[PDB]
């Protein structure tokens, strides 16, 4: 029972390391897209208000 639960942990963990990498390669790029899009939008909204002012 315990040798098995031990190995099962390492397998879990290892899948946890191997998964957390996939996700950190396929996310870092998408996060900079979203922030830049957000800052763009703030700026443009302000420009619209400035034109109105």
């Amino acid at each position: 029972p315990v040798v098995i639960g031990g190995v099962a942990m390492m397998v879990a963990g290892a899948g946890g390391i191997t998964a957390g990498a996939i996700v950190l390669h396929n996310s870092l790029g998408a996060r900079q897209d979203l922030y830049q899009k957000r800052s763009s939008l703030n700026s443009e909204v302000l420009i619209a208000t400035q034109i109105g002012n």
Binding site: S39, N42, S43, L46, I47, Q50
Partner: protein, 46 residues
């Protein structure tokens, strides 16, 4: 004679008021906000 002296003084009073009321004040351009700064101020606080 005193009347004559007083008119001198009146001439003084008149050059004071003319100095007070002379000139055309020139345009003043205030320093107003850009987006750069408004954004830098709002991202600072947050």
């Amino acid at each position: 004679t005193a009347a004559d002296t007083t008119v001198k003084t009146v001439l003084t009073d008149v050059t004071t008021i003319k100095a007070q009321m002379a000139g055309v004040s020139p345009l003043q351009v205030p320093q107003t906000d850009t987006i750069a700064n408004f954004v830098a101020r709002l991202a600072a606080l947050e």
